[PDB]
Symmetry: D5
Subunit: 193 residues, 10 copies
C-alpha cells in the first residue's frame, strides 16, 4: 500500500552539509522539530538535476520561513556530491549550495520510498514530511521532466494552513485565497462564490 | 516497485459521460489516440472534491488543446455521480460538468494505482498517462490538500515538449522558457544562463 | 452459515434519524434490543427507496416489538445524507427516522455473505436476537422488494417461540394457534386441520 | 461468496415421488424447463416440518401454474420419507403428498447450499431457482420458525413478472399492484405516491 | 485397528426401552457392563427389523452375562421412536426394550469404521468388555446375522477372562 | 474407511501347499473362479491355534463343495509352517493338513487387511471374498476362542443364497 | 552413516533362555557388565542355520571366559525358537542350546542394525558390542556359509588386547 | 543395506602396481572379476602397512580365485605413490603390486558407509561377485584383520555359487 | 568460489579511453583477449587514483601480453567522465586510456563477491582467460594499493603455464627456471636450490 | 557475501609443529596476540607446493619480526604432513620446516574459506588475519601458479603501516615510499608527483 497520509519510512544517510563537511542525517532528528522536504534526483553530473538543485537552493529562505528542512538525495556517494559542488556552474556543476545532500549509496532510501528506477537511480520525487513524521505529499516525475519550486511551496503553504485552522484547501489555493471548513455548509458556501 | 516511467495498470470502469448518459471507459481505448489524466478524489458530496472537479472542468479546453482525456475517479457509484451532477453548486453539488466521471465501485482501480486509503477511499491523485500507455507523472495529496490545475498543465506541456524535441525540461520550465539538450555541453550552457 | 449462530460483529459510521453522523456497532444492542439489519445495493437507485420508505412508514411497528431498524449499503454516509435531503419527487428517500449504516469498506457485506461481484450488497434481511443470534436470513437477487408484513410476521414468530416455548407452524401469525415441540403435540395440531 | 444471483450448486439425490415410488432427481433435468423451489427441513418425524410440507402440498396447483417444481429435502433416507407418507396426519404423518421429497442422506446437498446445522440437520430454507439455473431467492429460518406459502408465491410472482417486464418491483409488491421502471424518472414517478 | 485396543469414544442421543429420549455415552459403562454395540443401515428397511426383534427377544440372555445391548444407525431419534410405534404388520420393530442410538452426525460409524459410502453403517457387531477393550468385531456387507453366535462369543470371551 | 463391501486388497504370498511343496498364491488367480476364505491366526507353535486349523481342515470337503478356497495366514515363514505340519499332533503340531498356509513374512498382508496387532502378529480373523473379489464378510477376534466352523459355513450359504435370490 | 565405532542401537526383545523359559533381554542390562556378541540368522527351521547355532553353542564356554554374552536373533517368534530347540537334531532341530535366542518379531532390531533384507529376514551377521556399548566389529554375510567360530573368538581377543594395550 | 544387493558405483584415481596413475571404476569388472575392495584409514600410520603388505604377499591366492584386490583410503594418489616409495624401515608399504584407489572426495567411503567422523574410512572388506552383488561385508573399528579368513570367505562364496 | 571456473557474466555501460560512452560485456573477449577486471570502491576518493593512474601508466605492458584492462566501480559513467576531466592536481585521474565500467546496479560486485556492506566494491583483481576462466583473484580490504609488477608477474606465470605446460614455482618470474608437473620433475627443481 | 573486511571463519585443526610433534591449533588462540597468515595448498606430495612451503620457511624470521604466525593448510592428514617433512628435498620433500602445518582432513576449513576446488583439494590461497580477527587480504591462485613471498610481506607491511598511521597506501606502496593522507588535499598533494 501507500505511505501517503501515513508514517514516512525511516532513513539514515551520510551527507555533505552546506559548509562542505561530511556528516550523517536521519529522519528521527527532525521529528517534532521541523518539516522535511526530501527530494530525489537520479544522478550527479547530469542534466535536469543541477537546474533543480540550484533552483531549490535559491529559494532556501522561503523554506526557512516555513520551518522546512530541505534534503536532496541521490544514489551517488558523498564524495561525488562534494566534487559536484566544487565544479563551477559553467562546467555543469552545482556550485556551493547551502542545503544538505544525502548519499543513498545502498539504494535503500529510494527502495523504501518506492522511487528506485531499474535498480539503478531514483526518480525525481518530492516527499513532504510533517513534524509528526507523516507524509502529506508525494510527487514523482520521470527522468526528463523537471519540477516546480513554486508548487511545493504552495503545497507547504496549504498543509500548514490546514494544520493551523482545520480549514480545508480548495483547488488552486494560494495565500491568502479563501479556504473552506470541512462541512456540508461549508462546501456549499465556498462553491457559490 | 513503482509504475512511474512504466506501463499504466489497466482499468475498465462504468462511467457517467458529459451528457449524463451511462457507459463504460477503459484505458485501452485511448492507447495510441490520446493522453490520459486520471484524477482520483475520495468522495462525492464532500468538500475539496467539488472545487477540484469544477476547476478542472473550467479548464477543459486547455486539456482538449493538449490532446488529453480528463477522467475523474472515485469509489462512489455512477448513480451517486449523476445525483451530484444534478445537485446545484449552491447546495454542494458539481453541476453539469463536461468531462467523464469513473466509478471505482470495486475499489480495484485505486488498489492498482496504490492510492486506496484505509480500504475505503482513494487519495487525491494525478496520474498522467502518455499515448503509449506509460505513466509520466504521479501526484498524491492527502485528503485535506487540494491540487493545482496550472501545475498539471505545465507538467503536460513539459512532457509534450520533451516528446517533440528530445530536449529535457529544467526546474520551473514554462512555455516558452529555455529548454536543454540532455548532454554534457549541454547542461553546461543552460546553467550559465 | 451463521443462521442459528452468533451474528458477525460490525461497527459502522452511520447517519441517524436527525441527519447527524455517528457510529453503530452490533455489541451495543446485545441484551438490549433485537436487530433487523437490512442490506440494499445502492443509494440513488430504484427499488431501494420504496423498501426504505416502506420500512420507515412502519417504524412504530418495529419500536413496539423492541427492534432496531438498521439499513446498510456500500455508499458513504455523505451519500446517505445527500439522499435524505433529496425529496421523494426526485428519487430521494426524504427524512427517514431509522439509522442508515455506511459499509464503505464492504467488510459488513463480506462477513454477512451478501456482497455481489465485489461491488454491492444484495437485498437481504438479517434478524438478530437480544442474545446476538441470527434467527432469520432472507436474500433477494432481483429488485423484487421485500414485504414488511412478512418480517413483522417473522419477528412475531420468533418472539412467540421465545415467550411460550411453542414452535411456530406453517403460515403462523399473531395470534392464531401454535404447536408444542412434542409428539403429542404435533398430532393434536395436524388433526383436525 | 454467496450463490444468490449465481448458478445453483448441482445436486443429485434419491427421492420418493408422488406415487410413493423411489427414483432419482437431479438439478440439470429442470434446466431450460422448470423453475425449482428447493426447500429444506430438519427431520421427518418432528413438529414444524409436516405442517409446512402439508401446507405446500395443498398449494401444489399454484406451483404447477407457475411452472415451478416443488422439491422437499431433508437428511432422512427415502425409506424414512416413505414411512412418513404411510403415517396418518393424526399420528404425526404427512400422509400421501403429491410432490417429490429428496433424500439428502450424505448431507452433501445441505453442505452445498450452506444450510447444514451442526453437521446434523438442514435448517428451514427456501431456494428458488431460475429456468437458467440461477438462484434468485434464499430464505433461511432457524429450526423453530415455520414459513409462509403466500410469501414464497408472491416472491415467485415478483420474479416471473420481473423476468417478463424488466420492471423492477418495489417493497410489498403483489400480483399486480403498481410496479417500477428501473430508471430516473422512473423512481421519481413512483415515489409520488 | 482398535480390536484388542480401547473402544473409540461415543456419545449419542438415544431412545430408551420406555420410549423416552436421553443421552448414552461409552464412559457410563466402563468398569460396570459389557457393551454389545450393533450397527444396522436404516430404519424402515425389509431386512433390519428381524435382527433387532430377534436381539430384543433374547434380551434376558444379555442381562444374564451383564451385557448392555445397543443398536445404532444414522437415523434420528425421532425416526427411531416412530419405528417402535409402527406395528409389526407394517414393517415396524415394535416396542423393543433395549436402547437405540442416533448416529445423526455419522461420527460413531466413522470412528468404528463401518460407514459405507458416507451414507449408512454396515451390519456390524462390537463387543466392548468392562475395561473398555474391543474383544470382538463382525462386519457384514445385506447379510443376515445370528443371535446364538454372539452369545457363544460373549460366553467364550467371558470364559477366557475368568480363567 | 473399510474394505468390507469394496475390493479386497491384493496380496501375493509364498505358500506351503497340501502336499508340503512350496509355491505362490495371489488374489487375482481366484477372481471369476473361486470364493476365498482368508483366515488369520497369530503364530505357529502356540497352544490354542492347532485346534482351530485342525477343525477347519476337517471341514475342507464342505468348502470345496461351496466353491471356496480356504487359506490360512500368519506372520511366520513357510519353513515354520512346514515344520509345524511335520510336528505330530501329540507334541502340539497340526499334522498333514490339506489346505494352503500363506506366509505373511513381510506383515504386509496383515497391514492391508488391518488385522496387524502391535506391528507383530495378526489377530484371529475371517475374510470372505466372493468370485468378484469383493469382501462380503469380516470377523476379528482379539483372543482366542474360536471360532464356529459352522458359522463361516452358515454365513457362506447366504452370502451365496443372496448372490442368487433376494433379501 | 554407520554405528561401528559409535553407540550400538538400543533393543529390547522377548527371549528364550537356556532353560527353555521365557523373558526379556535388553542392551542396557549389559553395559558395564558384559561384552555382547549379537548374531543374526535368517529363519528357524532352515537347512543351513542349525550347524552355525550348534557350533556357537559348542564354544559357549570360551565366550563366558572372555566375558561375552552370546545372543542369537532372528525374525521368528519365541514360540518358533522353543519348538526348534525341542526338534531333535536328526529331524533338523537345534536341540537344547544354552545361550539366549532373541525374537525380532517386530523386525525393529534388524532394521536398527541394518541387517534386514527385503523387509523380511535378517542376513547372517555378527555385531560385537563392548562393555561401554560401543560397536567394535561388524560382519555381514549374504549367504550362507559361515562363519568361523574361531574368527569372532580371534577378533574378540584384540579387540580385548587393544582395550588394555596398544596398536 | 547393500549386502545382497548391487555394489554402490565407484570411480577413482588409482596408483597401479607399476606406479603409474590411472582410473579404476566398478563397471570394468562386472561379468569379468570378483572384487575385494578394502578400506583403511590413512597412509603413513603404524597399523595400516602390515595389512596391506600381508594382502600383497598373498596376491597369487587372489589371482587364483579371479579376485581383484583394491585398497582404498581418503588419501590422494600422490600420497599413495610416496608411501610405496618409502622404505619398509621407515614405515613404508614398499612396492606392492595391487592397485590403491584414491578416495579424495570421500564419496566412495560415504557410499559404502564406512566413513567415520567425516574424515577417514574404517577398516572394511567388501567382496563384490562377478554379477556386481555384494556378498560379504566386514567393518572393524583400530582392530587388525586377517588374510586367511577372507580367503576362506571367498572360497565359501565361490563354492555356494557353483553348486 | 569461481577461481578455476568460468567468470560470471557481466554487461556494463562504460567510459572509454576517448571519453565516449559505450557498453562492454565479458563474452566479447572470449577467444580474443585476456581480461584484468579490477574493482575499486569510489571515484573522487583516495588510493583509487594512484591505482588507476599506475595501471594506465603501464598500459603498454598489458597490450603486449594481450590483456584488456577494465576498471569497475559502483559509480555512474557520468561520475567516471567527471573524474577523467578533473586534473591530477585536484584529485582527478585525468585522461586515462583504458575503459572504466559503471557497476551502477551493483550486480557485478555481487556476482564477483566483492561488494562490502551493500555499498561499494572492495579493491580486487580478477584475471580472466581467453577461455573465460578465472585464473587469479586478489582482494584487499584496506586502502593499501595493489602492485602492478605482481599482476604482470601473475599474467606471465599464467601465460607461461599455458605455453609450455610447465608449472610455475614460488617466486617465479619471466624468465627464470620453471618446473614440469611431474615427480621427476619436482625433485630436479628442489635440489640444488 | 565475502569475509574480506569482516571476521575470519573460525577453524580448529590437528597440526604438525616445527619440532615434528602433533597438536591442535585454532584461530581464537591468536586473537589479540598475533597476525595470522593462513595459506592453503592442494596436496602434499606434488609440485608447486613444496617450493612455496620451503620459500615461506626460509623467510620465517621476517614473519616473526612482523608478529605474524605462518600457517600452512592442505586436505592431507597430519601423518602425511609428518612423512613429507621426513622426506629429503632431493626426493620431493619439504624437509624439516619450522612453521606449523594444519591438517584439513574434513575439508571444512577449505569450505569455510571458500577455497575448496571440486570437493577435493584447496586452491593456493593466502589469507591475512588481523590481531582483531578481521581478514584484510585474500589471494586465490589456480593450482598451477606459485605465489610470491616478497609480495605478501609487502602486503603485511602495507597493512601494519595503515594500522599505525591511518595513512592510506597507494599503488605499488613499499616500506617505505611516499604514502597518502585519506583526505581531499590530500589526494591533490600526492598526485603531483
Amino acid at each position: 500500500p501507500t505511505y501517503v497520509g501515513k508514517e514516512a519510512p525511516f532513513f539514515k544517510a551520510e551527507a555533505v552539509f552546506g559548509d562542505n563537511s561530511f556528516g550523517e542525517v536521519n529522519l528521527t532528528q527532525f521529528i517534532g522539530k521541523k518539516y522535511v522536504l526530501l527530494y530525489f534526483y537520479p544522478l550527479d553530473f547530469t542534466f535536469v538535476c543541477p537546474s533543480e538543485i540550484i533552483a531549490l537552493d535559491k529559494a532556501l529562505d522561503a523554506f526557512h520561513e516555513r520551518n522546512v528542512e530541505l534534503l536532496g538525495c541521490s544514489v551517488d556517494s558523498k564524495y561525488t556530491h562534494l566534487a559536484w559542488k566544487k565544479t563551477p556552474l559553467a562546467k555543469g556543476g552545482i556550485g556551493n549550495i547551502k542545503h544538505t545532500l544525502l548519499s543513498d549509496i545502498t539504494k535503500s532510501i529510494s527502495k523504501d520510498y518506492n522511487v528506485l528506477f531499474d535498480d539503478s537511480v531514483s526518480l525525481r520525487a518530492f516527499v513532504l514530511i510533517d513534524m509528526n513524521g507523516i507524509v502529506q505529499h508525494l510527487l514523482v516525475n520521470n527522468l526528463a521532466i523537471g519540477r516546480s519550486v513554486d508548487e511545493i511551496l504552495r503545497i507547504i503553504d496549504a498543509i500548514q494552513h490546514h494544520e493551523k485552522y482545520g480549514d480545508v484547501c480548495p483547488a488552486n489555493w494560494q495565500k491568502g485565497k479563501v479556504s473552506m471548513k470541512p462541512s456540508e455548509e461549508g462546501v456549499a458556501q465556498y462553491l457559490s462564490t
